[PDB]
C-alpha cells in the first residue's frame, strides 16, 4: 500500500518515533505497513500495533461520545449534529474495519503460539466491541456475536495455555468482562468474570519474579476498580 516502498525495519523504527512524538495516526499507518509486509509480528511489534490503533480509536470513541450526548440533548422534548456524529462514526468504523482486516489478512491465521493467537483474538473482540458501541442496523446482533465469539476463543486458549497471571490473559478477561457489562447487558457475568479472574491470578502471584508481579498486579487493580464501580 502507501508504505509499500519502505523497509519493514524502517516502518517499525518510525512507529517507535511516532509513539515518542505522540503521533498515533502516523504510528498506526507505519504499523499497518509493517503488517502488510506479510511476516509474523514479534511481541514488541504486536504491542506497537495495538498501542497505535488503541490511541486512534480511543480519540474517535471519545469524540463520538461527546457528539452522541449533544445529539441526544437536541432531540429531547438542524441536521448538523447528526451529520457530524455520523461523519465521526463512519471514520471510527473505517479504523475498526482496517484493524479487523489486518487480523483477517493474515495475522490470526498464521498465529500458532498462545501469546500471539490470544493477543490477536482479544484485538478482534475489542474492535468488534467498538463497532458494537455505535451499531444500530440489521447487523447489530451479529456484530455483538462476533465480539463474543472472538473473546470466547481467546479465553478458551488462554485457560489451556497460559498461567492465570499472564498479562494478556488478564487484559482479555478485563475487556471481555467490560463487553458483558456494557455491550451484552450481562452485569452478573461481567462481575463473575472479573472476580474469578482476580482470585485465580492472586493465588498464582507467588510464582512470579518482581517484574512479572508488577505487570500482573497492574491489571488486577483494573479488575478491582471495575468491581468497585459495579458493586
Amino acid at each position: 500500500g502507501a508504505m509499500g516502498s519502505m523497509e519493514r525495519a524502517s516502518l517499525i523504527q518510525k512507529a517507535k518515533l511516532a509513539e515518542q512524538a505522540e503521533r498515533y495516526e502516523d504510528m498506526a499507518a507505519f504499523m499497518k505497513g509493517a503488517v502488510e509486509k506479510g511476516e509474523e509480528l514479534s511481541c514488541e511489534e504486536r504491542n506497537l500495533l495495538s498501542v497505535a490503533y488503541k490511541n486512534v480509536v480511543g480519540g474517535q470513541r471519545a469524540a463520538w461520545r461527546v457528539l452522541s450526548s449533544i445529539e441526544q440533548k437536541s432531540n429531547e422534548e438542524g441536521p448538523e449534529v447528526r451529520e457530524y456524529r455520523e461523519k465521526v462514526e463512519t471514520e471510527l468504523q473505517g479504523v475498526c474495519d482496517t484493524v479487523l482486516g489486518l487480523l483477517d489478512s493474515h495475522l490470526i491465521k498464521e498465529a500458532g503460539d498462545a501469546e500471539s493467537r490470544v493477543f490477536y483474538l482479544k484485538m478482534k473482540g475489542d474492535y468488534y466491541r467498538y463497532l458494537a458501541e455505535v451499531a444500530t442496523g440489521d447487523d447489530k446482533k451479529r456484530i455483538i456475536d462476533s465480539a463474543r465469539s472472538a473473546y470466547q476463543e481467546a479465553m478458551d486458549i488462554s485457560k489451556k495455555e497460559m498461567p492465570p497471571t499472564n498479562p494478556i490473559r488478564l487484559g482479555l478477561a478485563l475487556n471481555f468482562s467490560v463487553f458483558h457489562y456494557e455491550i451484552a447487558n450481562s452485569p452478573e457475568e461481567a462481575i463473575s468474570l472479573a472476580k474469578t479472574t482476580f482470585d485465580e491470578a492472586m493465588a498464582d502471584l507467588h510464582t512470579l519474579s518482581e517484574d512479572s508481579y508488577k505487570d500482573s498486579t497492574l491489571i488486577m487493580q483494573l479488575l478491582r476498580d471495575n468491581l468497585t464501580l459495579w458493586t
Binding site: 478485563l174 475487556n175 483494573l222 471495575n226 464501580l229 459495579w230
Partner: peptide, 5 residues
C-alpha cells in the same frame, strides 16, 4: 466508564 486495556 470502566477500565479496559
Amino acid at each position: 466508564f470502566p477500565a479496559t486495556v
